[model samples]
Target: MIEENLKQKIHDKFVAAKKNGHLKVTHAESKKLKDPQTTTQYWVTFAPSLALDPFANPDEELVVTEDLNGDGEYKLLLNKFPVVPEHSLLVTSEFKDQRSALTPSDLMTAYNVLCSLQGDCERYLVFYNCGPHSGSSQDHKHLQIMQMPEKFIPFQDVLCNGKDHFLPTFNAEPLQDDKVSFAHFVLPLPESSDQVDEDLLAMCYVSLMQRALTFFQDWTNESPELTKSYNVLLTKKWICVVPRSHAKSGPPLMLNINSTGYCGMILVKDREKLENLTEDPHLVDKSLLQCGFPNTAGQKPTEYHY
Candidate 1:
């Protein structure tokens, strides 16, 4: 289990790093932008000043703590340059491609960390940006962890209510929510299973990814595997995978569709884009529709047997 004061330790380290001029953090201003249709609030956050490439080395002063996983292939560290406080990054001790296919150990490491974090009754979200098109900023392989912004995520509700539309099996459930307005799938984890089943979780994740690629191929008649870019969100309850078409909505648009975006929290670099999203009620939906796997009409959920 994780230390109860882990967040405080990270904050203390952050202060020390900043005092020593070893940490560079960009503070962002945020506002709640409402969607009148669903009455869902989206946080529009932007930093006035920014620094690029904050992860220069493995021994950076920002690292509050590190733990070796069972496999000894990678370690987890608190994120030094974070958009939000107490963020964590599970990175490979040895250099690895960010685009490489995830392994069972990867799933195990993430599961263990999540289990530990949840001990303090803190709800956390795990996310992954598969490639640059998915809004990944670094070439290093790392999965991210942060406290979920809200308790009741709207997408989870959409997934739960659409259970009848999903396949009978619990392995991999393809979902196309009319509310999300994007092509994505969600795999529900066993609600009763308290133990961390790494092998099962990894198998389910890979199976869902393959299903997502197949769905995209059928939708576009193109090979999604050739240039794969996607976002993955993992929690104790469910795993959501979103295949992306592009990183941004369009040229001159600052919105980037990362894993967080799929979490219904969109981060914009410009206030103009934020205003546009607020002004045009459908702008958020439209941008998501354009940047992600196109939502096909009459799309049906498929069963992916692991």
Candidate 2:
């Protein structure tokens, strides 16, 4: 029932938004990003971030959708300048720091939304950039969801084959997919049960986050405002954590990676970089190394079995 309602809502809302000039999309110039090893890659640019105050003016600040929990704690709003049509942002009603530590309630809320989003034909990826250094544009905390294209995320083979790529970690199982050229951890959730339990999912998330913080402390001594800067990607089956060293990859024609980049979807503001990526697929792989920790090859991922 929710899926059907959401489908219609997306259809109606998209048309209304585009007609009113609220919807903005930049389709990719080429879908020919060749990585002989993996599937085809596509790229697109999004509008520059504009400041917003959803708390003061929720209706005016965003293309608001239904409240997820029907308590105003979380709202499913359209991304005003979305790179993908009907892209949604799950935002808090009150102000919350982008770097604020996430609560079990937070992950529970997101999980509930994910349940509604998954269906027969549609697939959604939910992600978060914990801080500015993690490529977050808004100071307010929110998680983003977008319709995935036919193409699967990068490193499909490794993740699907269930390679033991993650290093051991305390309280949570951590593995870095062999294909990803960055320092990261993939925490696989237990298989879906007859009935999903919000508290169980939330606790698992908190455990993984706590484990990531431990890794962060060991990786760098520098203290961030609250915690380390990182990117998080959540699917029904697993949650990934990538600790970020920098947001920008290189100079002016740089790649500013958000959480999606870690999910194998790269978005660039400059066309030249996209062309560079096309000319040499390694352009992104190499740049991503600069922005993130060294690939799992040299560094030994700590082992702490959950």
Candidate 3:
């Protein structure tokens, strides 16, 4: 089991780091942007100024834990340049490729952290930005945990609403919201943590990866430099995967998307992009569609050479 005081420990470390000038959080203007097409509300945040990458060399004062779950493999550290307060990263102690697939231990550790942090009134999201077009800034493999925007509901919630835990099968497929423009597969997990384990989580990931990888194989003719890349978002309730085609959307929004974007949480760094997005929120959906594969909602699994 993970430490029951894990959340408090992170809070204490973050407060101390901020006080000692070891951590400098980005100040951002935050608001909600609604997609008229899907009626999805996204937490849009913009920082007028940004700073250098901290993950290049993690500061000693930013460290929350040297080892997580008594495992020397991973460390929990605060994000020194975060727009969201208390943003922490679970990073590998040894150097690992950001493009590599997550191991079973990785999945389990992230889930355990989510279990410890999420409460009735508070929710947390753990996300991985893997591959080339997954909007990852750090080449060192890491997963991020952040406080989900207040009262913000992702469309995946609706897709998995009232659903029971089950792996995708011939008869039963992963849930995808038809109204949304991009392709995403979501599976509801069993409510009780007692039902979750590394094996179960790995199975869910393998099935989703199968479908997401199918996109690249079929796109070889139309797209050049085709490679595999995707975002993995996990919470206590469900898991969602989005296959990314590009890092940033073209034209209008030109917003960079990571795992958070799939959760309807968009981060903007440039003022022009922010204004354009605020003017027409649905542009977010179009940008998402452009950067990802089209909606496969209602389509059979075998259709994609599955």
Candidate 4:
């Protein structure tokens, strides 16, 4: 689904962007902190400069492909103010609401991007943050890709390990981590990319999205027009779905979590708060729970009406 030289093209563009000073890199000190209580790990990043919108516009120098798929439909660009090295984005060439559902083309292209960039020493994460509370800053529809840490393991990865691929049906359901307080659905992908195709990945996404969308209907008090907020995390091995309720945790913590946060990669701007949070690291679950829907691990799909 991608040109064999796409990876090479991206590397060249990234090097030039850095040399020409078009890539405004945001430096953050990150820690792989583990919660003693839940054992959930986090890549807590401390950066005071992440307050502004970074993906406002695509710089011509940083763009790897003006038309990513050679279809004039998508543009692949390097993140201008990236907190992570080699971070890039695949954005719809035409303006579209970020909340729109991922089409078959979107799913296929994103998964293919992962395959092209990944190698023996290389792994990448393609994530989508949609809607108001999904921690998305831009109005433009975009999917972000960042290299995953060598040793960091997202809770979902552990949850989906050893499980065989299966669609979430009446008898079969997506895996959910009961240990955490938030609602997240995860499914292991076929081990080999050759075993996967657009229809297979699209089916997985659609089923998980249905569960995510149901949360909005149950919350009648929530503004219907506000749109459903959720995050989709994809790796070659697994796909995870998370439902978002609030943009950031309520007060004191004030942590604004995106798709990365769901996978235990959190960004912190305030220094003093991080210091205090480490003492009572269990509070991390509290903030995440406050920002997300409750864990539905024990609840039946019928009860949740999924």
Per-prediction tally of clashes: 0, 5, 0, 0
Q: In what order do the candidates fall by TM-score, top score first?
A: 3, 4, 1, 2
Ranking by lDDT: 3, 4, 1, 2
Candidate 1 clash pair list: none
Which runs of model 2 end up more than 4 angstroms from their true locations? 1-4, 30-56, 60-62, 160-172, 190-195, 218-227, 251-253, 297-306
Q: Write the per-residue lDDT of candidate 4 for residues 1-306, one digit (tens) a residue.
A: 465687788889888888889987787887777888889987777887765433446668888888878787788889877888778889888888898888889989999999988852677999999999999988789999899887888888889889888899877778898899899988899988888999999999999987787777654443454369999999999998899999899877888888988888877877787786777777788888887899988665456642
lDDT of 4: 0.84
Given candidate 2, what's the lDDT at residue 165?
25
For model 4, the superposed segments whose C-alpha errors exceed 4 Å read 49-57, 218-226
TM-score attained by model 4 = 0.92
Task: Assess the local accuracy of residue 69 in candidate 2 as a C-alpha lDDT between 0 and 100.
Answer: 63
Model 3, which residues run further than 4 Å from truth?
A: 51-57, 218-225
True lDDT of residue 18, candidate 4: 83
Candidate 2 global Cα RMSD: 4.8
lDDT of 3 by residue, 74-136 (tens): 889998878999999998887888999989999999999998877426899999998889998
